[model samples]
Target: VTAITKVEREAVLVCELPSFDVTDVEFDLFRARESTDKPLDVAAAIAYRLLLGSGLPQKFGCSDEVLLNFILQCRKKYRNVPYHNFYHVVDVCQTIHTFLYRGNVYEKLTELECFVLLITALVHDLDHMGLNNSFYLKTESPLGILSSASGNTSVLEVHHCNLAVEILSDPESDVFDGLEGAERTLAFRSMIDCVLATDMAKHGSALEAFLASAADQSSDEAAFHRMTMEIILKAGDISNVTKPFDISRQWAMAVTEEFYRQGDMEKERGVEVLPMFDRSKNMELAKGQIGFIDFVAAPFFQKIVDACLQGMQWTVDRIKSNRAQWERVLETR
Candidate 1:
């Protein structure tokens, strides 16, 4: 079996995860080069197979090489950006995939749900600019306004999804050749809905509310699973908080550096630095990680367990371990 490993590069690209320093079963996906042409191949396959075992091959109806090549193109286009880079997408995909396996939760999700999860993970941040939604908002950037004025996370996700599909739809790309119209539409819709759900601003309250409602009717296992999956994806979106101390620190530092770089650009453009991204100002990367884990990840995952015990224990355990690692790092700092 292929084992996953983390590499010691400055950024967390998928290609660098096979080095010895970060050797672990946790990094097993890195060992397989079966789909190098696909940017999200390892993640998608891991996610799909975890849910359906060998059954996934029958559903997707395409070779791994084709799917991987499509994913690789997406990654290539966005490699230089900070938050939306291929590594970030792959990391989130891996995080969710890990959650499914760690707790035997795969058996609980339907094929459609599993497909939705993997598709969302792969395209959640397509065409990202490495800046937060706030960046566009402060600058009156059109995306920020569209995201805000419409009060629609789905809209933003759909826009990006459309852009991605358009790229793949090109005859030169030859990405959509095998799929029938209905199948294409279904895949497109699932991917778009999942991607849109990543908007941090719109998802938190809605997710909290959904989990809260599930808690009220905890007897329905199916409803509980549905609710928990929603929160699971949300939690995975910012899951670096649940990683080992060093890994978490690395992610924090990378994000901070990206923010600072963006700030410098803003300064050059005569715009005041965004409060959190301003390097000369108070940007608390460590502090933010600590709080994000405690207030966000902990409560969110806990609520899922409160309603449905399906994967809560495993998620809670992972979060606790990650929290301990972060705390130790904080002490050393």
Candidate 2:
């Protein structure tokens, strides 16, 4: 049996999120099992069980039935979107699970905090429409109005969270059965805050604040743990950018296609096309892609590393490697 560190194990798990077919999922699952001797379902169960055994039982009030229902809702709602599907949710769950156990973060977080973080990751984009808030806002879509009025991430995310709660509250769903009073309320509130904070618009500022507070080095272990939780969630949100070049390119293609789709909608509505929002006809993939990485992903991740300085070098190196590969691809093309 090959023994792997939790972080490496988590990386393997998060890498399996792209499959939309059973054959693909099964293949990835086989790879994970062969690498770690742990099946995907078993890993998920262990993650859930670990959260529950650690005084965070309130988070798992939803039975597997309810959880599957939520997944189904997401699949149905986001049928057209390439990236933000049920597979992405599973990927994020695995990513957060790896982040928590890898990098010695478990020793820092309380059972409750870990539970909150994991749940937030799992449900943060439940039922995402595969479109960014900008699309809704520019077109003044109903979702845009709701998002503006709600004064948060976007209407879609808010709706998803609210619906999630509604599902949890149902007697048939009974996802929150054992929890009552203050514990339930507190957990629910924290989960909501974290999920809503995931909007890309606010991700930079939120991450800056999180890294600033958490990287004090002088802070107590408990303080560091809290910071780690924030870092994990924020990092996971953009982790794709730091992946190997070929993999990152695939993600970039999907995202760019989505952007193009939104642009087509805007054109149909007689709106001016937003830059980078649609690159379907634009052939400058290398320049645009690298600029995105340098301006957005690099600086953001660098700030995170500037604070904690742990496990970040590898990410930085990956970013550099990815850029080099992009350059090569451009040259060859």
Candidate 3:
């Protein structure tokens, strides 16, 4: 990995996010992007500001320069895909902040764990090509071959973790460089575990594991904390439905387009295309969001809150509100 240049750092530092609270659940990232022609720089600034404002980086001995370097390094790795782009990860980081601080989930974790979660958010989706693991496997692509031979279906997640390790290998961009021995090991291990947990194939098992851990009073304390970190990162990953209606719609649109693009490629390859991904189906965003709420977001948030993350009830509330708003859209149309 190359060292971050002064030009890149200055570009992010010059952005003025004026009036935007990076910590708020209602913070509008779409507006932030539209507010500047250089949306990439603005988004990077938001992540930079978030890390600095949290005061977590410094607490872990990561300096301002190294942190910005890490953010920039992450920025350089992301493709300009509709979903899973730099903006998505930035949104995840900001949303995770709200989950940690605003939702009072911070009480469940140590300060170091909180720091790791925030940092891991930025690294979680590095170098995403907009296609999911299933796409690679079904297509028998190069990465798919590697994943199949390796016995790991988490193609993209594994790729992301590899890039993350490369960036941190450079001392200039190593956000966790300040630590030694066990602390650093925990940082890397937990970060990789959290990222690996994001594979939706593991979602059901991961959620059940967390719930079981939370329910067991005598569960391993360290295991519970690690699982909590994994769960929070997972929460941030599918958090679009938990946002306000407009923001939720924007994300739905982007992800839909990305999915359609993948489906287009699949059609060209003469592979199977799911209805949700086939643009010919003319799927409505309302139905998509509502279906997701009923099957995924609502149940996940409700269970987690009921299990141990009571402080995150607002997320459950917002998902319900957003679901009803979508229901209203379907009713009118």
Residues 1-333 of candidate 1: C-alpha lDDT, one tens digit per residue: 111222211112344323422212255333443436553544434433333343443475544444444455555555576555766766776677666655445676765556556556666777777666656666777776787787753444656676677656654332345566875665566565556666777767757666666657444765555555665577678776656555667677778778888897788767778567677877456567768778777777776666554654756676788777667767898
Model 2 over residues 1-112: C-alpha lDDT tens digits? 1222345334333533232222121123223334444343333443443334344444456554443333333333334476665445545555555555543455566766
Full candidate order by lDDT, most accurate first: 3, 2, 1
RMSD of each: 7.2, 8.5, 0.7
The collision pairs in model 2 are 61-175
lDDT of 2: 0.60
In model 2, the Cα lDDT at residue 109 comes to 69
Model 1 clashing-pair count: 8
lDDT of 3: 0.93
Candidate 2, superposed: residue stretches over 4 Å from native:
1-78, 150-153, 171-177, 180-182, 216-230, 279-281
lDDT of 3 by residue, 1-333 (tens): 777789989999999899898899899999999998999999999999999999889888999999999999999999989998999999999999999999999999988899999999999999998898999999999999999999999999999999999999999999999989999999999999999999999999999999999999999999999999999999999999888889999999999999999999999999999999899997578887888899999999999999999889999999989888888888999
> How does residue 75 of candidate 3 score in lDDT?
91
Pick the TM-score winner. 3
